[PDB]
From Swiss-Prot:
Domain-level remarks: The coiled-coil is necessary for the cytoplasmic localization.
Induction statement: Up-regulated by IFN.
Species per Swiss-Prot/TrEMBL record: Mus musculus
Role, per record: E3 ubiquitin-protein ligase whose activity is dependent on E2 enzymes, UBE2D1, UBE2D2, UBE2E1 and UBE2E2. Forms a ubiquitin ligase complex in cooperation with the E2 UBE2D2 that is used not only for the ubiquitination of USP4 and IKBKB but also for its self-ubiquitination. Component of cullin-RING-based SCF (SKP1-CUL1-F-box protein) E3 ubiquitin-protein ligase complexes such as SCF(SKP2)-like complexes. A TRIM21-containing SCF(SKP2)-like complex is shown to mediate ubiquitination of CDKN1B ('Thr-187' phosphorylated-form), thereby promoting its degradation by the proteasome.
Protein name: E3 ubiquitin-protein ligase TRIM21
UniProt subcellular location: Cytoplasm; Cytoplasmic vesicle, Autophagosome; Nucleus; Cytoplasm, P-body
Gene giving rise to this polypeptide: Trim21
Portion of the full sequence shown: 291 to 468 of 470
Family affiliation: Belongs to the TRIM/RBCC family.
Subunit structure: Homotrimer. Component of a SCF(SKP2)-like complex containing CUL1, SKP1, TRIM21 and SKP2. Interacts with CALR, CUL1, FBXW11, HSPA5, IKBKB, IRF3, SKP1 and VCP. Interacts with SKP2; the interaction with SKP2 does not depend on an intact F-box domain. Interacts (via N-terminus and C-terminus) with DCP2 (via N-terminus and C-terminus). Interacts (via C-terminus) with IRF8 (via C-terminus). Interacts with ULK1, BECN1 and with ATG8 family members, including GABARAP, GABARAPL1, GABARAPL2 and MAP1LC3C/LC3C. Interacts with TRIM21 and SQSTM1/sequestosome 1. Interacts with IRF3.
Segments forming domain B30.2/SPRY: 8-185
PTM remark: Autoubiquitinated; does not lead to its proteasomal degradation. Deubiquitinated by USP4; leading to its stabilization. Autoubiquitinated.
């Protein structure tokens, strides 16, 4: 792909984070803590899952960023509506305002309803995410495999401002403590 020139500098929004997340001082890295991180509750925080939003809101244009997923067993990545549900149980789908892919139990899947199997020969250490607001497109790229396409959501109905979306996943196994990191431009 040739989307690199639409690179944007994403930072994480502490106020949206699940209360067990630890965000670095530079707001570029997030990981699961072993306990509640001693923050007050608020209506923005994701309650049920280890999720956080980027601070940036997008309503036009073309945007590209990259996320490091090295040595994680489970994670979700993509974009979502600013108005997504924060509290309680929900599935990641375009109907609920999410355009995402994930790793879970040694398989990669796109967050359609129902979910779609992905075909990845080279497990990615870094993921590129491309959003074309006007075209209604969200695409995912395998940076470890020379930028090969993972998945394209097309005919997207964004229906609002978009935010970068992250889920570091639970760490029941003791093998998923590693962070998500926003990679430098
Ligand atoms: C609990 C803690 O402080 N940890 C564990 C997770 N860590 C980590 C960083 C990068 C990568 Cl690739 C893998 C794992 C940092 C140190």
């Amino acid at each position: 792909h040739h989307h690199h020139h639409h690179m944007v500098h994403i930072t994480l929004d502490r106020n949206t984070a699940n209360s067990w997340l630890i965000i670095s001082k530079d707001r570029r890295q997030v990981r699961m803590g072993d306990t509640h991180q001693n923050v007050s509750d608020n209506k923005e925080r994701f309650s049920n899952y280890p999720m956080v939003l980027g601070a940036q809101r997008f309503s036009s244009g073309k945007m590209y960023w990259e996320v490091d997923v090295t040595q994680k067993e489970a994670w979700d990545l993509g974009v979502c509506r600013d108005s997504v549900q924060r509290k309680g149980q929900f599935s990641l789908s375009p109907e609920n305002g999410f355009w995402t892919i994930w790793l879970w139990q040694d398989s990669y899947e796109a967050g359609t309803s129902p979910q779609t199997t992905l075909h990845i020969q080279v497990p990615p250490c870094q993921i590129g995410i491309f959003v074309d607001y006007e075209a209604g497109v969200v695409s995912f790229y395998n940076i470890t495999d020379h930028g090969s396409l993972i998945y394209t959501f097309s005919e997207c109905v964004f229906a609002g401002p978009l935010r970068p979306f992250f889920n570091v996943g639970f760490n029941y196994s003791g093998g998923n403590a590693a962070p998500l990191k926003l990679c430098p431009l």
